Symmetry: C3
């Protein structure tokens, strides 16, 4: 379970959420995303492979992954309330923040 | 994410929890609190604007927010078991922790 | 005592999961585990009592606790889907990682000079 694997899991579950039809499928997908976001914050992306883990740059990376976890959790709260369309809209929005982090640290 | 709005979200959802009649209302509110607590730990509160992000003081702030997330999650477990009164009581203790954190870092 | 207490909570709920008969029992236990894993990442284990909290070694400990939280959350996703046997199997795998972390960071005082 490396960083790219966690990012792939985020991508795959975003596509599941977009096609889902009920709250339970959305919530399951968001829980898998939350697990991947937490895992990604413990992993080292390509751009940081030889950086000091206590560097400001590495801390910023980990905080960015926590930002994703916060957005995923808020979308989970919406879906738990039965606001499924709202949770799907929230997932579509956080896709862009996930993409920002993916593009910043990949390769 | 910004720290002040996360604190407001925590405060708002504590009041939702106090008024709640069933476990699902409590769980949803706790999930909004958990998202806010996670978000708050990625921000720099006013008291830390003059400190390095890698400082001991900034780490203590982020660990404090993680402590809050841990308490929220435990209250969520209680509410998931249908222990609404116990979850509301855990949330009352949560309020003290949130208040203290707000006063320390505002 | 905070770190040891959280490790005890993890172990206690792994047994709950092993004995569970439905998804809701597993989910509640995993949520208690997730709370304990998050709490443990704010604690200082015996092996780190003399180290700077901003040290690389303290950070590696906190990341190891986050690794547990990620595994617990994945098991929660399985149980939320109703895949109870699968979540219980994930929890058994989790026990191995919990034990590894416990052995790494617990006090080794009883083994000194053996
Ligand atoms: Ca892959
Ligand atoms: Ca791989
Ligand atoms: Ca406002
Ligand atoms: Cl976290
Ligand atoms: Cl037992
Ligand atoms: Zn964290």
């Amino acid at each position: 379970q490396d960083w790219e694997d966690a990012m792939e899991t985020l991508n795959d579950n975003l596509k599941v959420i977009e096609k889902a039809d009920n709250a339970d499928q959305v919530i399951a997908a968001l829980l898998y995303m939350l697990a991947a976001a937490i895992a990604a914050a413990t992993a080292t992306p390509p751009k940081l492979e030889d950086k000091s883990p206590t560097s400001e740059e590495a801390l910023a990376f980990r905080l960015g992954m926590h930002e994703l976890a916060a957005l995923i959790t808020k979308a989970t709260a919406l879906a738990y309330q039965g606001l499924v369309k709202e949770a799907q809209a929230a997932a579509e929005q956080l896709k862009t923040t996930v993409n920002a982090h993916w593009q910043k640290y990949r390769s």
